[PDB]
JSON list of C-alpha atoms and ligand atoms in Angstrom, two decimals:
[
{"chain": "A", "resi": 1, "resn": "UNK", "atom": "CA", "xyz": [12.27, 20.68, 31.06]},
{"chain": "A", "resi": 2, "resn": "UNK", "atom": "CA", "xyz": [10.40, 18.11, 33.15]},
{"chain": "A", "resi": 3, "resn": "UNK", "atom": "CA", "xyz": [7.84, 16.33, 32.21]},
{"chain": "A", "resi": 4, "resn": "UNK", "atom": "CA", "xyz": [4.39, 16.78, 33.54]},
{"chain": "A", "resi": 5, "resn": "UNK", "atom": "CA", "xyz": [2.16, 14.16, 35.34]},
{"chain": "A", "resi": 6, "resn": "UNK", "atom": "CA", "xyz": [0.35, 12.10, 32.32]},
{"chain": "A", "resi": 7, "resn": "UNK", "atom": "CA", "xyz": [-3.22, 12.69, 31.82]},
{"chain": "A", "resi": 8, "resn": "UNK", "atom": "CA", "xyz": [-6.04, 11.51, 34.82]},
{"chain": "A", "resi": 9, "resn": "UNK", "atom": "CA", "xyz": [-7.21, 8.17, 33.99]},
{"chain": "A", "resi": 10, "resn": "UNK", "atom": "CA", "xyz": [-9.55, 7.56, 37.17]},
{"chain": "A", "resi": 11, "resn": "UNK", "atom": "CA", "xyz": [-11.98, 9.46, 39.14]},
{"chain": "A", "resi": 12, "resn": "UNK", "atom": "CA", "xyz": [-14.48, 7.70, 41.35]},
{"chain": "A", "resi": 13, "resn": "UNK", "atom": "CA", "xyz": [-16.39, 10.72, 41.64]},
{"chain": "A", "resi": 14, "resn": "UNK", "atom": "CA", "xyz": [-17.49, 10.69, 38.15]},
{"chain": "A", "resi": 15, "resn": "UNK", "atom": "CA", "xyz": [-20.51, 8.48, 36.75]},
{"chain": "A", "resi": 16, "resn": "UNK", "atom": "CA", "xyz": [-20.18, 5.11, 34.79]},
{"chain": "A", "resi": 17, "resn": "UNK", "atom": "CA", "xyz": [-21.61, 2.98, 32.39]},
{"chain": "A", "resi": 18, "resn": "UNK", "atom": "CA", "xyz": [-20.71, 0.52, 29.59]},
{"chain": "A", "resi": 19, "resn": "UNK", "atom": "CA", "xyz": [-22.24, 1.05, 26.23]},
{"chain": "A", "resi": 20, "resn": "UNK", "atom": "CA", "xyz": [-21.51, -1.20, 22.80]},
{"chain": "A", "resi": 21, "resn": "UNK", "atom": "CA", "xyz": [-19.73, 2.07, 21.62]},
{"chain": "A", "resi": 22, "resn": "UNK", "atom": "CA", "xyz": [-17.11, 2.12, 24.12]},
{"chain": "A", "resi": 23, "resn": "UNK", "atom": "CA", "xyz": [-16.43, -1.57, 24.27]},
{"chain": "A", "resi": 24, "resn": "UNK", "atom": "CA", "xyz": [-15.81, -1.16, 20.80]},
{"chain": "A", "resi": 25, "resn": "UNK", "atom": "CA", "xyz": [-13.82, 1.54, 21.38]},
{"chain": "A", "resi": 26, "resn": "UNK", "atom": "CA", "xyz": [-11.74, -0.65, 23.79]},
{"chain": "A", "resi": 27, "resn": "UNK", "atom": "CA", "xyz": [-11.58, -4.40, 21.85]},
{"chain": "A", "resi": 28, "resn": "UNK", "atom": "CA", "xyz": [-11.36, -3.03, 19.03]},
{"chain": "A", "resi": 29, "resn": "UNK", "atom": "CA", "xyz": [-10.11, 0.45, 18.02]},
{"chain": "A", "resi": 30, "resn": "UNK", "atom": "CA", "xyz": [-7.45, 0.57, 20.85]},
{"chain": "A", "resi": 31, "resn": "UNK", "atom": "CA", "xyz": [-6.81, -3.26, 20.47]},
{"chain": "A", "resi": 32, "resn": "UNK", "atom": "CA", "xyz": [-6.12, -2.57, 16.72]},
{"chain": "A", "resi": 33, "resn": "UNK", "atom": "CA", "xyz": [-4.00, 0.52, 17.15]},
{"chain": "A", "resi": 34, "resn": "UNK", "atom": "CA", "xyz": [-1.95, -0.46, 19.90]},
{"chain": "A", "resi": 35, "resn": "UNK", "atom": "CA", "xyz": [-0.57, -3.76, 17.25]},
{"chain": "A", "resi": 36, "resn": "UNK", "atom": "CA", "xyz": [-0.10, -1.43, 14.81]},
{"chain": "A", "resi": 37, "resn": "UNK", "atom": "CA", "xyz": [3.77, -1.12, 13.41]},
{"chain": "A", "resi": 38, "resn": "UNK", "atom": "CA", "xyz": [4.12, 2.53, 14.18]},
{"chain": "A", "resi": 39, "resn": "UNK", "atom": "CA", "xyz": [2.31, 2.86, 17.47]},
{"chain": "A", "resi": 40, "resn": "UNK", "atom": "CA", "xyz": [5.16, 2.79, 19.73]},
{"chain": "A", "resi": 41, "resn": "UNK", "atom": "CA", "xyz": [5.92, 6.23, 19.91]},
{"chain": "A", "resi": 42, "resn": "UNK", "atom": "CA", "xyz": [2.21, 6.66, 20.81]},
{"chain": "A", "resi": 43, "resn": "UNK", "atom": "CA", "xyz": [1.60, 4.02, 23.58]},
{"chain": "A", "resi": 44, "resn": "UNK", "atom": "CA", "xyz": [3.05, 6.12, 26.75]},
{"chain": "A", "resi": 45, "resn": "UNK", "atom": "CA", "xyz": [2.52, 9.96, 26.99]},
{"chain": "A", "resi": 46, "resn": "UNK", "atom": "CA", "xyz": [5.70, 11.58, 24.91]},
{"chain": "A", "resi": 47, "resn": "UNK", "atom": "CA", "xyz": [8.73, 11.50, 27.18]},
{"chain": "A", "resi": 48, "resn": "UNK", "atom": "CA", "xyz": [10.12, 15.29, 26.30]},
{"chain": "A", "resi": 49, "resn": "UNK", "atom": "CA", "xyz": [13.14, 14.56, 28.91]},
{"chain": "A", "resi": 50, "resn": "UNK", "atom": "CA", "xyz": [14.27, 11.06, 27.29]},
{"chain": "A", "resi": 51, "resn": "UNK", "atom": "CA", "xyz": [13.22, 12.24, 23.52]},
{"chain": "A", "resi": 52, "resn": "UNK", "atom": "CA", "xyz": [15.38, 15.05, 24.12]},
{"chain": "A", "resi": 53, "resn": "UNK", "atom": "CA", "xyz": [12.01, 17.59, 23.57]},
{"chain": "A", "resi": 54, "resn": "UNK", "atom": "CA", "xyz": [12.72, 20.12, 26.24]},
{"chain": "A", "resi": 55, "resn": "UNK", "atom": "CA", "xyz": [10.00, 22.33, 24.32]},
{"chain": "A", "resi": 56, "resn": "UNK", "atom": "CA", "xyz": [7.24, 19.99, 24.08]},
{"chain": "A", "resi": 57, "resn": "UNK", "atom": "CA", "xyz": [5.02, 20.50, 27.06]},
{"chain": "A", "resi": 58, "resn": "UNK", "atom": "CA", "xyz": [5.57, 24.69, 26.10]},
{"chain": "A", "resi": 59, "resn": "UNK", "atom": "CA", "xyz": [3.98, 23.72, 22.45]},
{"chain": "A", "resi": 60, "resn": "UNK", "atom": "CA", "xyz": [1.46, 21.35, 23.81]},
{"chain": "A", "resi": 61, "resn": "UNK", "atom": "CA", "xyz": [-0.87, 22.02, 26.50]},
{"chain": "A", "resi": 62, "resn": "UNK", "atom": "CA", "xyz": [-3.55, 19.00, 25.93]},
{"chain": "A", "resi": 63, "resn": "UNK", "atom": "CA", "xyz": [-1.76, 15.85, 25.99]},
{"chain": "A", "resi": 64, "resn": "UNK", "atom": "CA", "xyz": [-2.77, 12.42, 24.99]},
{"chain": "A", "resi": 65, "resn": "UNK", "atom": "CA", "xyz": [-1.39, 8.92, 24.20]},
{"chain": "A", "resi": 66, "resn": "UNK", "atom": "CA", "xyz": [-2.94, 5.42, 23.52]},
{"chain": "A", "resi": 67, "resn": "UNK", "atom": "CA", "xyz": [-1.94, 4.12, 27.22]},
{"chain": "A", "resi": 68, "resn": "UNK", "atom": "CA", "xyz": [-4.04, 6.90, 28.59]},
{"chain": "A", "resi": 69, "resn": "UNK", "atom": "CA", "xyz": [-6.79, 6.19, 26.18]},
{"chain": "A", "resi": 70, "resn": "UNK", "atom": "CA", "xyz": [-6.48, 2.38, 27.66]},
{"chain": "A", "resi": 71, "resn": "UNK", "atom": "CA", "xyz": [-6.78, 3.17, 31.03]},
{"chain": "A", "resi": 72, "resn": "UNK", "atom": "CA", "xyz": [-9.45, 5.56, 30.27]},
{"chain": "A", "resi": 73, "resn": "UNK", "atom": "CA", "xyz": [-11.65, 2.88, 28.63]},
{"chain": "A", "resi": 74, "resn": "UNK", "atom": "CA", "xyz": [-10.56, 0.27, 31.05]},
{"chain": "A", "resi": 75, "resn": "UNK", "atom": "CA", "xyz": [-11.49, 2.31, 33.58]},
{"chain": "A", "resi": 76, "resn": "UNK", "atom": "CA", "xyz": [-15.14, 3.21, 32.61]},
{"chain": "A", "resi": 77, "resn": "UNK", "atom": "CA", "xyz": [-13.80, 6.85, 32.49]},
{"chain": "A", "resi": 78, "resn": "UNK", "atom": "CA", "xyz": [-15.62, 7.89, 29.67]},
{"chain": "A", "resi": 79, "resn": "UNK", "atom": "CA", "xyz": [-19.21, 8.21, 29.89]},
{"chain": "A", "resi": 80, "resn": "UNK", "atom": "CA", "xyz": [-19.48, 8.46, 25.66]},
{"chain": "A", "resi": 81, "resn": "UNK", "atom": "CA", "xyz": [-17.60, 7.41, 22.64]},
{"chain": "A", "resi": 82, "resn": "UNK", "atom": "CA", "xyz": [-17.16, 10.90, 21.84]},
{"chain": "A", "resi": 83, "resn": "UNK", "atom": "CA", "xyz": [-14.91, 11.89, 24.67]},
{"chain": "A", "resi": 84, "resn": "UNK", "atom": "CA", "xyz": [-12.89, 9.06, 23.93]},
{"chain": "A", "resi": 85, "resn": "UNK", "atom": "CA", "xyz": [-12.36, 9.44, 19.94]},
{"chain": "A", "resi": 86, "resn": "UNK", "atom": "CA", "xyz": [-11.64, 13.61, 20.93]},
{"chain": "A", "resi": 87, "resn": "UNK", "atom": "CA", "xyz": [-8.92, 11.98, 22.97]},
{"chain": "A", "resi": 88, "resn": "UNK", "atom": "CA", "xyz": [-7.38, 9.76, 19.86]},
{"chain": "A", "resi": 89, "resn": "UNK", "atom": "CA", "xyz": [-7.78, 12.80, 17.34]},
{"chain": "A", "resi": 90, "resn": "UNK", "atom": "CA", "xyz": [-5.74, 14.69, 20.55]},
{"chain": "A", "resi": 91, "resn": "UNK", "atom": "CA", "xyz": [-2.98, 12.97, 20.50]},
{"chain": "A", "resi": 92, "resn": "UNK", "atom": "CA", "xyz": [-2.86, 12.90, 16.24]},
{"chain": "A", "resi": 93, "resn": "UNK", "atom": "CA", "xyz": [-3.37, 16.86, 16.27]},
{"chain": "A", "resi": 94, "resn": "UNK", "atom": "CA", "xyz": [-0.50, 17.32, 19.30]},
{"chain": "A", "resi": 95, "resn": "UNK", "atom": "CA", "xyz": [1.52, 15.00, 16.43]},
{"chain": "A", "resi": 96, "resn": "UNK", "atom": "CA", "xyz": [1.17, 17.45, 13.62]},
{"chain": "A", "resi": 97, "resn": "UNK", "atom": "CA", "xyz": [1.29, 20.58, 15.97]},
{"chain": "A", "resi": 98, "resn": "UNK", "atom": "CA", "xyz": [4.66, 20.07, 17.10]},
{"chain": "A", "resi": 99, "resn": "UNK", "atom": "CA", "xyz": [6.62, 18.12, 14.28]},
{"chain": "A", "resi": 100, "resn": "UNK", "atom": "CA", "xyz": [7.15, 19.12, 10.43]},
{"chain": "A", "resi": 101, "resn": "UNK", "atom": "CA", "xyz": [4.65, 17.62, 7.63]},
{"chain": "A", "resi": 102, "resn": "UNK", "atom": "CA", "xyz": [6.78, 15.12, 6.12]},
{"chain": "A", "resi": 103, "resn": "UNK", "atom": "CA", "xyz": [8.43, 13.93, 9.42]},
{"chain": "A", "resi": 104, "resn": "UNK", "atom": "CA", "xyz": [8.93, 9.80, 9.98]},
{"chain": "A", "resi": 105, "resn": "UNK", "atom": "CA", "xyz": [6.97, 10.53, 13.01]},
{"chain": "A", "resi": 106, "resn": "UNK", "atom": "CA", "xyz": [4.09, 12.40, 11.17]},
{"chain": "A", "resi": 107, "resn": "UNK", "atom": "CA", "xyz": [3.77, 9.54, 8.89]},
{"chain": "A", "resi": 108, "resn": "UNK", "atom": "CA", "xyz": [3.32, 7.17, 11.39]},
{"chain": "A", "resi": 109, "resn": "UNK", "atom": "CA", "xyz": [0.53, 9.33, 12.97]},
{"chain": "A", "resi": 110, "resn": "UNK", "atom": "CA", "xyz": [-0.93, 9.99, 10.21]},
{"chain": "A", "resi": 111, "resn": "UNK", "atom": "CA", "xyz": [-0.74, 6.09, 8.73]},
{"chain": "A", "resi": 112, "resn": "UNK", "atom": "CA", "xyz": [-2.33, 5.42, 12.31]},
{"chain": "A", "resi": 113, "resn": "UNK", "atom": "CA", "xyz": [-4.90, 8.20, 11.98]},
{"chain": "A", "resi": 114, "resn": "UNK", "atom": "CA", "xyz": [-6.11, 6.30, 8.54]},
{"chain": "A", "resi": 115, "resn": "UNK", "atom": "CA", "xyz": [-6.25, 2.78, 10.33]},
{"chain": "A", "resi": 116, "resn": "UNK", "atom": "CA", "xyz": [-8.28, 4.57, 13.32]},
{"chain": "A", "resi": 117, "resn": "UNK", "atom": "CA", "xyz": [-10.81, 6.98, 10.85]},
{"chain": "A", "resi": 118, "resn": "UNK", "atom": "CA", "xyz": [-11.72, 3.38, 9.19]},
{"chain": "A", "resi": 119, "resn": "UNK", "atom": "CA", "xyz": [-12.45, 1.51, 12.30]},
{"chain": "A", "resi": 120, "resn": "UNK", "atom": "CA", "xyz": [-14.59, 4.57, 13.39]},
{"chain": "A", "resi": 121, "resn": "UNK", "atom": "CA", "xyz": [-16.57, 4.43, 9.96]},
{"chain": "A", "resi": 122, "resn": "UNK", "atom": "CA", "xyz": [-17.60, 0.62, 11.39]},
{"chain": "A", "resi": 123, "resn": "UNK", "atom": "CA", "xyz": [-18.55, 2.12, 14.96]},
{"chain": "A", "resi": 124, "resn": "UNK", "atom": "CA", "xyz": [-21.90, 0.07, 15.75]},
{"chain": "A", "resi": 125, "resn": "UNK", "atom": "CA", "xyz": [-25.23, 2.58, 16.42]},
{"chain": "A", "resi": 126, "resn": "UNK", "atom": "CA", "xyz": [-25.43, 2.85, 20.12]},
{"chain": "A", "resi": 127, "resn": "UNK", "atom": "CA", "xyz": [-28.37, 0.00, 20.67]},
{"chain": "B", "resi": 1, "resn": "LIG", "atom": "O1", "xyz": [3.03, 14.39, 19.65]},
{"chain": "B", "resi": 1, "resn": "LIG", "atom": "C1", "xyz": [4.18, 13.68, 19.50]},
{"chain": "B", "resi": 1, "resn": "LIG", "atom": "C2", "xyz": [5.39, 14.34, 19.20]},
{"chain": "B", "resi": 1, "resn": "LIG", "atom": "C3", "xyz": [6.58, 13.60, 19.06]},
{"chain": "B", "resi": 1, "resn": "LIG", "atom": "C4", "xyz": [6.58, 12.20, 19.21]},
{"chain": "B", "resi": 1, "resn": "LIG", "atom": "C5", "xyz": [7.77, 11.45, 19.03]},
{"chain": "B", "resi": 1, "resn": "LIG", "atom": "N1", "xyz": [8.89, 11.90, 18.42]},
{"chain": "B", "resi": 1, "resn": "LIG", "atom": "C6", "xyz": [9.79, 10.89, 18.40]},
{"chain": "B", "resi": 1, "resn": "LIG", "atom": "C7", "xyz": [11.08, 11.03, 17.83]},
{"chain": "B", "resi": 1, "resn": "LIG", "atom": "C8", "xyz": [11.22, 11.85, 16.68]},
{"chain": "B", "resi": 1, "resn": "LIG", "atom": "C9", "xyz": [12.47, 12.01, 16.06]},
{"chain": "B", "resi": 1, "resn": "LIG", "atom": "C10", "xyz": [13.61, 11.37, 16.57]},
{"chain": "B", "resi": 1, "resn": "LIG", "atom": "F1", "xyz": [14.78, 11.53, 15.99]},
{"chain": "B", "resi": 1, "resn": "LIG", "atom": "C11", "xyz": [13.49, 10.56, 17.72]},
{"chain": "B", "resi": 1, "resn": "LIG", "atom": "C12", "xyz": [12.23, 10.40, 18.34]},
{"chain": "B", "resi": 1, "resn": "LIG", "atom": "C13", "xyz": [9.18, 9.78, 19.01]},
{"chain": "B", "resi": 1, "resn": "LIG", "atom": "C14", "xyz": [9.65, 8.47, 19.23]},
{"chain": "B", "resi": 1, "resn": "LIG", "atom": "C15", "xyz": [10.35, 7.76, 18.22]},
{"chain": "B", "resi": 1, "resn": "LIG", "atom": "C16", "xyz": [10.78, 6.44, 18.46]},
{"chain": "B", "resi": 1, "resn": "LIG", "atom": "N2", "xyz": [10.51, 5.86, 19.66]},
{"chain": "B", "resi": 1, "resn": "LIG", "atom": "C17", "xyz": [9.83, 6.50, 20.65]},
{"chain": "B", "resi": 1, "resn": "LIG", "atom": "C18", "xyz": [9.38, 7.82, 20.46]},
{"chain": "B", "resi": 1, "resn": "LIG", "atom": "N3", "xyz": [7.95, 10.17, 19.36]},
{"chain": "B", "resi": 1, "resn": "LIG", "atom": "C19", "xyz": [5.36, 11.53, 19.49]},
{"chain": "B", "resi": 1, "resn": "LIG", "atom": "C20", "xyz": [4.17, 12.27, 19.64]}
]
């Protein structure tokens, strides 16, 4: 069926504040990603209409996609790195949830899901 509006990326009613964490989180784990051969199917929330997916948004109640996760940083949405790597681990989970193990497209998350657990390991202590 139709898709559903993508995730809220902006709400001025809700604190802010930049920490290392999240600019890190920002240049470089969603910089890094986003290049990444297989991460155009997870740049823009999963179009279940154009993918042909009419069952998608039925399977999975909590989506998430990389241009969210952009916005989200950009936006000072997050108020700690922890909301925002939930978020990336989101989207991979929704991956796995609704396709087969083995899939093209659980490869690529799951190649993706390697590149992002290593540049988490190098997340700088929050100074
Ligand atoms: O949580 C999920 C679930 C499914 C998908 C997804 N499946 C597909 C997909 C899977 C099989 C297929 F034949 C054609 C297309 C894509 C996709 C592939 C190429 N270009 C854009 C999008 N993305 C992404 C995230």
């Amino acid at each position: 069926s139709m898709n559903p509006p993508p995730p809220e990326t902006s709400n001025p009613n809700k604190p802010k504040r930049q920490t290392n964490q999240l600019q890190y989180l920002l240049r470089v784990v969603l910089k890094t990603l986003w290049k990444h051969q297989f991460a155009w199917p997870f740049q823009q929330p999963v179009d279940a209409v154009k993918l042909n997916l009419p069952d998608y948004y039925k399977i999975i109640k909590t989506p998430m996609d990389m241009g969210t996760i952009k916005k989200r940083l950009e936006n000072n949405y997050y108020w700690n790195a922890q909301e925002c790597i939930q978020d990336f681990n989101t989207m991979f989970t929704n991956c796995y949830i609704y396709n087969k193990p083995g899939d093209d497209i659980v490869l690529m998350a799951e190649a993706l899901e390697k590149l992002f657990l290593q540049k988490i390991n190098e997340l700088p202590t929050e100074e």
